[model samples]
Target: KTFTVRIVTMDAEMEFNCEMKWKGKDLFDLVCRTLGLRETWFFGLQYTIKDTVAWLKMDKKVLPVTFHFLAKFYPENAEEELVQEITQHLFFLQVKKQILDEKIYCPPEASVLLASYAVQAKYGDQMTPEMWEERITAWYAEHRGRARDEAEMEYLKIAQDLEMYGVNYFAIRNKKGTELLLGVDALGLHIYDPENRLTPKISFPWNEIRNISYSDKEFTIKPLDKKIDVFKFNSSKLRVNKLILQLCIGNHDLFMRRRK
Candidate 1:
């Protein structure tokens, strides 16, 4: 069976007829080819169902006739689109899961930034501050049974932080079962404690790092001068390890040539 697929991007839209059996990647490739999008990794195809933006599952069958292409990160001033939209969406979903599980906690100063993204994910971009407050209040009320005024106060205490912007953050448990947010960026790696946002608990610069190795559920970061720091995750070992490896390997040459 063939379906007329309507693809919508921020600045343009197009349509193509595709077979039902075509996977998400195939559809993505077709869209990129059609639109002449050479830097294809920055965008993603999403379909809204019941007001939720969902990724086009690559291995699953294509059933939708329409998909909206969106940038995972704010692309206005990015040097290059570093992360894919699906990867960002996955990270956002994981962070939301951790929040719902009460495994993630944000101080008053940091709550608003996280809340802002949550609001955007649920509502959308271009929302005014008032709109953000209203929707966020409602969300907190629905989920945590908090009063609107309380939620507003929470948002009021928020200050902007862009360190995690356009980066993939993972909620992982260390060997001590402590939950930490692992952020991967072009610069390097960062370990953040959700409870504290004053500064990252630990940071590793790409130029300083020698190698990253993983065994079993543990991944080790070996710096040139510092002792190796090992982290163990309850799950997602392979994905987390592979991602760190890829980011480090890909950025090593750039870091060396550009900075040194």
Candidate 2:
């Protein structure tokens, strides 16, 4: 049996016909390939089932379906390409939920950072702040009362997390039980304790890092000239460990190729 699959984005819609036996991932790859999307890890194809948004399970056989393409944010640049698009999209939606619920109450500076990225993602980077403000105002003009207020507030809240602009950042707890920010890029890893007012406490250049490993809640970093450093998080250890491991392993090749 053949089925029709419709893929929708904010700006476009695409359709494909495939055999019913095709797996969900096959449909996902087909859509990504059709759209010329190279980093499939940053996007997802989701569908609403019985009024609830749910995953397009790859292990299941395909059916006539409609899916929406969504973007995601990843904590580690190296691990971004390794994430499944479905997972990325789900997390992206969660961020949206947090914003709508007013659960993100960072300082104004941080709010500006996140809002800038939200504007950029929605309106494109070419638009200036004035232009974006005008467009957003008009866009929400039809929305009234609490709805409009909530929408505006959500956007403002999203504007603060600067890491959304381009950087890959993760939130983790140090051994001392203090929350810290870890940023990853082509150069290396940066550690920041926001309580200290945003200055990076230290930077570990990839060139100077010897190895990385993790056990349970502890993530260990081995540097060329310094003693091993261990970062402990109270939860989400597996994810943090995987992210660091992938960064170290993948960027090792990246660093080598840059020199040649």
Number of the top TM-score candidate: 1
Worst 10 residues of 1 by lDDT: 152-161
Q: What is the Cα-based lDDT of residue 69 in candidate 1?
A: 76
RMSD of each: 13.7, 12.5
Best prediction by lDDT = 1
Model 2's lDDT to the true fold? 0.57
| Inter-residue clash pairs, candidate 1 | none
lDDT of each: 0.58, 0.57
- TM-score, structure 1 vs. true: 0.47
> Per-residue lDDT for 1-260 in model 2, tens only?
77787887645677788777898888888877775566665456666555434556677887536888764333333223334433433344455555545554356665566566556444411999999999998988666542112333344334334343323456777778888877665556668775542446877777887766677766666677756554444336454555455545555655555556
lDDT of 1 by residue, 176-244 (tens): 888887766656767879665335788888777777777776667777675655444443545455545
Error of 2 at 143 (Å): 38
